[PDB]
Design an enzyme around this catalytic site. Structure first.
Site, mmCIF file in Angstrom:
data_model
loop_
_atom_site.group_PDB
_atom_site.id
_atom_site.type_symbol
_atom_site.label_atom_id
_atom_site.label_comp_id
_atom_site.label_asym_id
_atom_site.label_seq_id
_atom_site.Cartn_x
_atom_site.Cartn_y
_atom_site.Cartn_z
ATOM 1 N N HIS A 17 14.456 2.156 18.393
ATOM 2 C CA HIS A 17 12.965 2.329 17.867
ATOM 3 C C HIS A 17 12.539 1.654 19.170
ATOM 4 O O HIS A 17 13.046 1.146 20.066
ATOM 5 C CB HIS A 17 13.354 0.052 17.399
ATOM 6 C CG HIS A 17 11.934 0.401 16.930
ATOM 7 N ND1 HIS A 17 10.938 -0.038 17.032
ATOM 8 C CD2 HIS A 17 11.319 0.258 15.200
ATOM 9 C CE1 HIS A 17 9.598 0.056 16.248
ATOM 10 N NE2 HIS A 17 10.667 0.259 15.056
ATOM 11 N N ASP A 19 9.296 -0.055 20.056
ATOM 12 C CA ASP A 19 9.717 -1.781 20.458
ATOM 13 C C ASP A 19 10.352 -2.017 21.062
ATOM 14 O O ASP A 19 11.153 -2.757 22.293
ATOM 15 C CB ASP A 19 9.360 -1.973 19.236
ATOM 16 C CG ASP A 19 7.577 -2.231 18.962
ATOM 17 O OD1 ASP A 19 6.947 -1.805 19.642
ATOM 18 O OD2 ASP A 19 7.828 -2.472 17.855
ATOM 19 N N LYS A 20 12.238 -1.705 21.017
ATOM 20 C CA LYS A 20 12.869 -2.024 20.984
ATOM 21 C C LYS A 20 13.458 -1.571 22.450
ATOM 22 O O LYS A 20 14.252 -1.421 23.565
ATOM 23 C CB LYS A 20 14.693 -1.968 20.641
ATOM 24 C CG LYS A 20 15.131 -3.275 20.118
ATOM 25 C CD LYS A 20 14.781 -4.454 19.284
ATOM 26 C CE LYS A 20 15.059 -6.186 19.913
ATOM 27 N NZ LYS A 20 14.050 -6.317 21.002
ATOM 28 N N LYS A 160 16.211 0.937 11.759
ATOM 29 C CA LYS A 160 15.805 -0.466 11.350
ATOM 30 C C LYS A 160 16.382 -0.466 9.519
ATOM 31 O O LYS A 160 17.033 0.744 9.071
ATOM 32 C CB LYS A 160 13.855 0.071 10.377
ATOM 33 C CG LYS A 160 13.346 0.614 11.654
ATOM 34 C CD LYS A 160 11.548 0.109 11.470
ATOM 35 C CE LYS A 160 11.082 -1.053 11.420
ATOM 36 N NZ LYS A 160 9.552 -0.927 10.971
ATOM 37 N N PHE A 229 13.025 11.911 8.692
ATOM 38 C CA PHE A 229 12.787 11.056 9.322
ATOM 39 C C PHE A 229 13.656 12.212 10.446
ATOM 40 O O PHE A 229 14.698 11.283 11.017
ATOM 41 C CB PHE A 229 14.051 9.454 9.042
ATOM 42 C CG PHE A 229 13.511 8.859 10.795
ATOM 43 C CD1 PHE A 229 13.007 8.847 11.731
ATOM 44 C CD2 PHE A 229 14.107 7.752 9.890
ATOM 45 C CE1 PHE A 229 12.307 7.716 12.810
ATOM 46 C CE2 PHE A 229 14.109 6.229 11.123
ATOM 47 C CZ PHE A 229 12.752 6.669 12.070
ATOM 48 N N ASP A 237 6.249 6.575 16.680
ATOM 49 C CA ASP A 237 5.217 5.472 17.114
ATOM 50 C C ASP A 237 5.602 4.351 18.491
ATOM 51 O O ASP A 237 6.655 5.031 18.865
ATOM 52 C CB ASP A 237 5.515 4.677 16.120
ATOM 53 C CG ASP A 237 5.564 2.687 16.353
ATOM 54 O OD1 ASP A 237 4.788 2.496 15.908
ATOM 55 O OD2 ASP A 237 6.446 2.004 15.624
ATOM 56 N N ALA A 238 4.173 4.392 19.052
ATOM 57 C CA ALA A 238 4.041 3.916 20.278
ATOM 58 C C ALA A 238 5.072 2.349 19.832
ATOM 59 O O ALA A 238 4.937 1.862 19.081
ATOM 60 C CB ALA A 238 2.988 3.493 20.060
ATOM 61 N N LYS A 244 9.438 -7.500 18.922
ATOM 62 C CA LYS A 244 9.796 -7.547 17.959
ATOM 63 C C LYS A 244 10.568 -9.240 17.737
ATOM 64 O O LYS A 244 12.356 -9.270 17.974
ATOM 65 C CB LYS A 244 11.311 -6.526 17.650
ATOM 66 C CG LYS A 244 11.009 -5.430 17.750
ATOM 67 C CD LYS A 244 10.615 -5.092 16.163
ATOM 68 C CE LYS A 244 10.377 -3.925 15.074
ATOM 69 N NZ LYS A 244 8.980 -4.143 15.921
ATOM 70 N N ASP A 270 9.311 -20.555 27.910
ATOM 71 C CA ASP A 270 9.296 -20.067 26.606
ATOM 72 C C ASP A 270 10.425 -18.829 26.327
ATOM 73 O O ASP A 270 10.799 -18.750 25.491
ATOM 74 C CB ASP A 270 8.263 -19.778 26.187
ATOM 75 C CG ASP A 270 7.562 -18.203 27.093
ATOM 76 O OD1 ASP A 270 8.092 -18.339 27.848
ATOM 77 O OD2 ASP A 270 6.740 -17.579 26.145
#
Ligand code: NA
Lengths: 373, 368
Positions: A17, A19-20, A160, A229, A237-238, A244, A270
């Site tokens: 993915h 983002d990951k 996902k 897919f 997807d950027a 996440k 954090d």
């Protein structure tokens, strides 16, 4: 009875993915610095889009890091090794916009900000995590396993998953009854047919991961629900680091105060204090003091000791919340500089955290419950 | 039975918020020409650079140099001395743009929460309302010239002392306020701190919540001349808790900015807020958390859940029936009900997406 049950949903995403991908690269960079300089300060953002990995941020370190190697080896490991898959570690553009400088009593380091961190734990799984997020993570891990061992050679790295569990309340504890709905979307090759994919996802993935007692004839399956897919990864997807954060933590359960983890060294409270709050919560549940707990640690800017700690046990303890607080204060030192020492956070352990959740895995120091005295 | 709670907000010049605002400026530019534009615009900001990345399906012809530079100008970065200049910064575009009802499928899977609390008139937590309003007041006084030394980058943090009241939360007092704001090279620290207390905090925070023990940390790290992207990096969707409820309630993980209505991360989060606020304003509960979830390509939500913290005489199952009777949470219906094709998104990208009366998701629906 319907009147006493509720639904709850969590999601997870695979290593590919977009983002990951960025989270993993950001933590690979962090680890590369920490391997050479244990006191490196790192704030590394990664951006991924068709044919591009861009690294941006600030580093203060004595390390000399080969970013071509770090980035390309990460992308190779994830499994993007050909144009036919939408992305290739061999031929992608790596753009380095990081600004690195050289550098010039740790227990007394003040919190950098006024702020709030949450830890959460629940006895509903052995991992002390919500069943929804545990199952969602494990479904992605299983896809990767079957992709990499060649059992399902049509799989690609982007995936996902989403799991809805039907629960009952049991005196503040939550009792999973059944899996209500499962969603799986996974990138795939151009040869494989939809029906074969859906069958494999049910039989080789879901039934390998979800205990049979939670599946029944009414469980709803949305498997490759949008149809094909083929296009996936950064082409589809950027992706960006730190997008996440709920997947990384509790899947919507407990609470979240707002910081992302990946690409940030352990001096970022954090991250480190979020880990310590988890450690507290898990220790309370594994110690038999409660079945479910939310630990809320507040820090005052420039002060090392927490300003306040609140424990919310949802009515799942014989002890009062004040008693639990005494136990926590006797057994934990939640000063940021002491957390770093006690959980050994200067080690290059971070790339492992960047997919499949930061919580619920026994290989991390904050997941080894402390025996409480 | 008292506890402390802290929320944070950031100003328009904070590099993450710059990215959110630019992403929504781009979205608005598309929607002005093509109401059915599909937009997923991510922005990255660092020393000297704005980069746009993502996917668009639109009939609009958008000049991205102009949209980006006009947004940076609006934020207030117009000179090297401030750390960033719309006239001379690098703008890089990596957007992949293609040409192109009630049962349109969700554009992605995901989960989204809505939250409301009766502790303020706007049905929001006091901590986040005050944090946002402090930043908004700084921007107001910067833009009207009354504090001419102000610059765009800021951070605020508000700690409130609460009591629990059978699942409801009762604000007692403001415990601590932190404000850090970028400034010019002429103004002295003591004058800034005085102005922040007298012209900002006292203008925003009700006097009843301030007392002689309230702690004020004003410009706590000292000088703050340079800010924004200079020596920093920002990204779209890295302030999602600031954008929503400030740590209260829950979050499903999806960012808002740069996304059109088919991205349920945004539209369903707005609808879930609308539901939660409607429940509280309708007198059905004092405090409530709404969950919804979707699968990609499926219109109806996979799940809807209502948690009232024990603040209703009605069961949570009863509240769920009321919600299902009064709301249709398919993306194609939500777009109509909340008017989500309108180019109103840049305004949402700082000071919070919720608690502001000019937005359709903040107008409670009369139930039944
Ligand atoms: Na590692």
């Amino acid at each position: 009875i319907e009147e006493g049950t509720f639904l709850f949903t969590s999601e997870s995403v695979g290593e590919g993915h977009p983002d990951k991908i960025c989270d993993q690269i950001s933590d690979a960079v962090l680890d590369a610095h920490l391997q050479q300089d244990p006191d490196a300060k790192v704030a590394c953002e990664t951006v991924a889009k068709t044919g591009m990995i861009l690294l941006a941020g600030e580093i203060t370190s004595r390390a000399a890091v080969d970013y071509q190697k770090v980035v390309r080896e990460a992308v190779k490991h994830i499994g993007y090794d050909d144009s036919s898959k939408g992305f290739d570690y061999k031929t992608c553009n790596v753009l380095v916009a990081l600004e690195q400088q050289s550098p010039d009593n740790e227990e007394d380091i003040g919190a950098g900000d006024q702020g709030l961190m949450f830890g959460y734990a629940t006895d509903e799984t052995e991992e002390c995590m919500p069943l929804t997020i545990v199952l969602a993570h494990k479904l992605n891990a299983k896809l990767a396993e079957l992709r990499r061992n060649g059992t399902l050679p049509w799989l690609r790295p982007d995936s996902k998953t989403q799991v809805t569990v039907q629960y009952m309340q049991d005196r503040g504890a939550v009792l999973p009854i059944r899996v209500h709905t499962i969603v799986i979307s996974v990138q795939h090759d151009e040869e494989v047919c939809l029906d074969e994919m859906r069958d494999a996802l049910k039989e080789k993935v879901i039934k390998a991961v979800v205990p049979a007692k939670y599946l029944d004839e009414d469980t709803i399956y949305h498997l490759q629900p949008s149809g094909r897919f083929v296009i996936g990864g950064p082409q589809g997807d950027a992706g960006l680091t730190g997008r996440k954060i709920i997947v990384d933590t509790y899947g919507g359960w407990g609470a979240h105060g707002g910081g992302a983890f990946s690409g940030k060294d352990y001096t970022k409270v954090d991250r480190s204090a979020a880990y310590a709050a988890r450690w507290v919560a898990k220790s309370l549940v594994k110690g038999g003091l409660c079945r479910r707990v939310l630990v809320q640690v507040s820090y005052a800017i420039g002060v090392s000791h927490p300003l306040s700690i609140s424990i919310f046990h949802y009515g799942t303890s014989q002890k009062s919340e004040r008693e639990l607080l005494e136990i926590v204060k006797k057994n934990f030192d939640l000063r940021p500089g002491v957390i770093v020492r006690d959980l050994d956070l200067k080690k290059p352990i971070y790339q492992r955290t960047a997919a499949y959740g930061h919580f619920g895995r026994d290989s991390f120091p904050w997941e080894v419950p402390k025996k409480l005295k």
